[PDB]
Amino acid sequence: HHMDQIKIEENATGFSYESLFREYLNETVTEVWIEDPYIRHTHQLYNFLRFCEMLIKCKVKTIHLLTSLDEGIEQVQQSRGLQEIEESLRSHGVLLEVQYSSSIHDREIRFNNGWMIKIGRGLDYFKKPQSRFSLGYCDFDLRPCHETTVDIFHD
Amino acid sequence: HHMDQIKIEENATGFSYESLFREYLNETVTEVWIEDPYIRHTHQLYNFLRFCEMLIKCKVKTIHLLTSLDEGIEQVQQSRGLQEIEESLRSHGVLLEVQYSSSIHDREIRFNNGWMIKIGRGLDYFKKPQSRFSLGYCDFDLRPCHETTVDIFHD
Ligand SMILES: [Cl-]
Ligand SMILES: [Cl-]
Ligand SMILES: [Cl-]
Ligand SMILES: [Cl-]
Ligand SMILES: [Cl-]
């Protein structure tokens, strides 16, 4: 069932993952699935980390990530980054399962309460900060966004 | 008036600035003063930025920072970073006033509503993250702390 459509306008703020996922996430959620072909660059690896921080801060014990393995220069940090996130989650009693596919195109987030969130840009919807010390560098509610569509579904 | 003493134990979590300053910061606060000799290094400048993000997200219009200039070459990066924070604040309609003193030793945060918060380590009370991609790297509520005392005062 298609439940809602949220339009994130160009340069819009108030879209941290905490703000965006709020309505669909509650204490009953114990398992999460994320399909995103673009978790390779530093900022994309940190976006996934912040998504995991939100889920554990909330009773998630299992996170599944389906992504594409980087073929080039990003491969080393992508591997080191994803293994570090998995080890940090393990230390929190959380299982992270990473699967790779070069044939993935869909961007989909699924919670075991039945909610599904499809973002056009996946988790990678923020613009680069104006500077190294600009407001919104750390608090993503103050970070301007790229124009994107968020589609909400329920099982 | 000395109001309360909060002991931050070694390796304690749940101490982001948002969590720590919650009880003393409300819609009525329009002006903030911070005295901290250690707003020099990249991590200390980011600490100050996250403190400003919290105040701006509340109707704070004026922020005063009294700090110490680093004695060495690090002063170039501290001065540049502080100017970047001031320009980002300016763009948000917020005035940041930075003053430097080689004779300041006290750590004191003052809100216009009468509340005063003195942290032993100032804003710089977090431990280094376990790894580059560990939970708590971005969300400070998951970041382990150094042992410190927080003293609360009211005018
Ligand atoms: Cl976020
Ligand atoms: Cl970023
Ligand atoms: Cl913080
Ligand atoms: Cl009060
Ligand atoms: Cl840090």
Domain ranges for chain B? 1-155
* Residue tagged 């298609």 (tokens): A2
N-terminal to C-terminal alpha carbon distance within chain A: 6
Handedness of CA A98, A100, A106, A107 (dihedral sign): positive
Sign of CA dihedral A40, A43, A47, A50: positive
Measured at the alpha carbon of residue B65, what is the angle toward residues B64 and B67, in degrees to the nearest 5?
Answer: 155
Say if CB A21 and CB A50 are below 8 A apart. Answer: no
- What is the C-alpha separation between A50 and A44, in angstroms, rounded? 10
Of A10, A31, A1, which is closest to residue A125 (Cα–Cα)? Answer: A10
CATH number of A1-155: 3.30.870.30
> Residues A144-154, buried b or exposed e (16+ Cβ, 10 A)?
bbbebebbbee
CA distance B24 to A79: 43
- The strand pair at B62-67 and B31-35 is best described as parallel
Q: CB–CB of B53 and A135 under 8 A?
A: yes
Look at residues B57, B90, B31 and name the one whose alpha carbon lies nearest to residue B82.
Answer: B90
Question: Computed over its alpha carbons, how large is the radius of gyration of chain B?
Answer: 15
Residues contacting A40, CB < 8 A, separation 6+ = A67, A68, A70, A74, A78
Backbone angles phi, psi at B39, to 5 degrees: -120, 65
Contacts within 8 Å (CB) and 24+ apart, A102-107: A102/A68, A102/A69, A104/A35, A104/A37, A104/A66, A104/A67, A104/A68, A105/A37, A106/A35, A106/A37, A107/A35, A107/A36, A107/A37
DSSP string, A59-122: ---EEEEEEPPP-STTHHHHHHHHHHHHHHHHHTT-EEEEEE-TT----EEEETTSEEEEETTT
Residue B144 forms contact with A (CB below 8 Å): no
- Smallest CA-to-CA distance from B5 within B143, B146, B117, B122 is with B117
Q: Which two tokens stand for residue B5?
A: 């003493």
Q: Do A135 and B56 touch (CB under 8 A)?
A: yes
Contacts of B133 in chain A (CB under 8 A): 45-46, 49, 80-82, 84-85, 88
- Check B131 against A49: CB less than 8 A apart: no
Query: How many whole angstroms separate alpha carbon B75 and alpha carbon B73?
Result: 5
Q: Running DSSP on this structure, what letter comes out for residue B114?
A: S
Residues A153, B19: Cα–Cα separation, whole Å:
33
Method: X-ray
CA-angle at B45, arms to B55 and A22, nearest 5°: 45
Under 8 Å between Cβ of B100 and B68? yes
Distance CA A96, CA A49 (A): 11
Residues whose CB is under 5 A from ligand 5 (ion)? B 43
- Among A46, A57, A138, whose Cβ lies nearest the Cβ of B53? A138
Ligand nearest to the CA of A126: 2
B76 touches chain A (CB under 8 A): no
Contacts of B17 (CB under 8 A, 6+ apart): B50, B51, B54, B123, B140
B18 to chain A: nearest residue by CA?
A139
Residues of B in contact with A132 (CB under 8 A): 81, 84
| Calpha distance A79→A75 (Å, rounded) | 6
**Pick from A6, A55, A9, A4: nearest CA to A32:** A55
Phi first, then psi: what are they for B46, rounded to 5°? -70, -40
Which residues, at least 6 apart from B140, have a Cβ–Cβ distance to it below 8 Å? B15, B16, B17, B50, B126
Place of tokens 């996130």: A85
Phi, psi of B49, deg, nearest 5: -60, -50
- Rounded to an integer, what is the distance from CA B153 to the centroid of its chain? 17
Residue A114's φ and ψ, nearest 5 degrees, are 110, -15
For residue A155, report the distance from its CA to the centre of ligand 3, in Å. 36
CB atoms < 10 A from the CB of B31, how many?
A: 16
User: In this complex, is the C-beta atom of A63 within 8 Å of any C-beta atom belonging to chain B?
Assistant: no
Q: Is B73 helix (H, G, I), strand (E, B) or coil?
A: coil
- Interruptions in chain A after residues (C–N over 2.5 Å): 57
- Chain A residue whose CA is closest to B43: A133
Q: How far apart are CA B22 and CA A87, in angstroms?
A: 32
User: How far does residue A139's CA lie from ligand 2's centre (Å)?
Assistant: 10
CB < 8 Å to A82, chain B: 133
Residue B23 CA neighbour count, 13 Å, CB half:
11
Which of B146, B154, B153, B151 shows the shortest CA–CA distance to B15?
B146
Answer yes or no: do B84 and A53 touch at CB < 8 A.
no
The dihedral built from the CA positions of residue A116, A117, A118 and A123, taken in this order, carries a sign that is negative
Instruction: Give the ligand with the smallest distance to the CA of B45.
Output: 5
Contact call for residues B95 and B89 (beta carbons, < 8 A): yes
Instruction: Return the residue matching tokens 């703000």.
Output: A19
For A38, residues 6+ apart whose C-beta sits below 8 A from its C-beta are A44, A67, A68, A122, A124
Q: Residue A35: CB partners within 8 Å, gap ≥ 6?
A: A66, A67, A104, A106, A107, A108, A109
From the list B123, B142, B1, the residue with the least C-alpha distance to B53 is B123
